[PDB]
Symmetry: D2
Subunit: 120 residues, 4 copies
């Protein structure tokens, strides 16, 4: 299932609980960037996916402020969970930093992360 | 926080009602004017609760999974952006809408776009 | 084609000069108002030369590599979007700006945004 | 170098020539979507990359019209070439379909393709 401890290709750790009615709640620890230790995350997932082989849509957010650091930024991940022997969460993400209006054009990074439950 | 909290409408005519908590939480409901959607959907997200004071926006994001007690689109949108405060407050965003797909169709699972929200009263 | 061909300016104040060829080619120059850029840069792209006639936009895209004979930013932007014709013609786009990075920094190589171009005369 | 025949994770074939001063010219054949046979592509790349280990920035466009089909759409790929024993081109892409104004919100797909010169 979605609940568990996940790792992406960068070595970041995503610990999440999927509530029965669609909540995602957990913590995120990034291996890269202006980040240290765990950050709060919240999100949502489709708690009644299609029964045709399709993945389960989901998304979550981290604001990059915790007791250690504040990067004045937030990332959202949007993607789908694909169950099976080697379960996967495939995502695309948007990292927005707070900027002035004149620099808003360069406020948002985009990328893609794939998660599995295999520990580095 | 008082800044973010409130009712907002985007260029499509969608409605965003949000509460910003002291801990960095965003909670509320979203009603989309378009797509496979009807009525209100739960949203949850996070914002920078101690932002820069140097004329920068406040970073934030939130998610809606497009399932409520009336419809299920088997999809989820995330919005990533910044709140720009002041008397004409704005939330400027980019978003990713992922649909659940089969593996063969995963290449076409995700739409991208941008929404600008205006605060109402 | 006559529609796309011309001079266009975006919300940043950047300048796009383009010629649309009968074969679907776009050629021209781009001058950015912002970033690690000065003067004009070559652009090349493609457009749908036989678009739908049913009130839909004309799909198109183009690339600028941010090297000219005056500066090199070691980066490239692609714009993907549609031309909306008529007396107030627009090109509405989303873009991806990739910088060359080391492998360890590749996760932060790409910016995303959106530009709207207005045709001038 | 960039010039050559490349394949992505979907099995699409990208045949390209990198001109000395920054042009990319070639053809693209997609394994998926509303597409058959080869399509014209053009793009640009950094013809004098940094000498610090960094990749070479590049991008290209395909409009999905050829003598067989017209999907009334265009894709742009933005990314970097990474040389070495197993050269790679890592990209993110935007696929815009012509739409009415009211449907423009759903006009643009986003994804990511990785290319190598290894034939399936
Ligand atoms: O530098 C920052 O502003 C905060 C840390 C951002 C790290 C990002 S989020 C997207 C990507 N996936 C990760 O696991 N880490 C980076
Ligand atoms: O069609 C779906 O799968 C569900 C509805 C998605 C509607 C989206 S979310 C991004 C954009 N902004 C809105 O206010 N509505 C659309
Ligand atoms: O800073 C760079 O690496 C080169 C200049 C990039 C400027 C970009 S491209 C997308 C956006 N639209 C513009 O008109 N300018 C910026
Ligand atoms: O369906 C269409 O509108 C035309 C074909 C699009 C296929 C795309 S482009 C991005 C992705 N990478 C590929 O190799 N194929 C798909």
């Amino acid at each position: 299932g979605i609940t568990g401890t996940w790792y992406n290709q960068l070595g970041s750790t995503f610990i999440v609980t999927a509530g029965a009615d669609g909540a995602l709640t957990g913590t995120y620890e990034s291996a890269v960037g202006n980040a240290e230790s765990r950050y709060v995350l919240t999100g949502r997932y489709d708690s009644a996916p299609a029964t045709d082989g399709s993945g389960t849509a989901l998304g979550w957010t981290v604001a990059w402020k915790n007791n250690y650091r504040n990067a004045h930024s937030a990332t959202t991940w949007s993607g789908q969970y694909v169950g099976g022997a080697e379960a996967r969460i495939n995502t695309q993400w948007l990292l927005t930093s707070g900027t002035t209006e004149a620099n808003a054009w360069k406020s948002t990074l985009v990328g893609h992360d794939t998660f599995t439950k295999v520990k580095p």
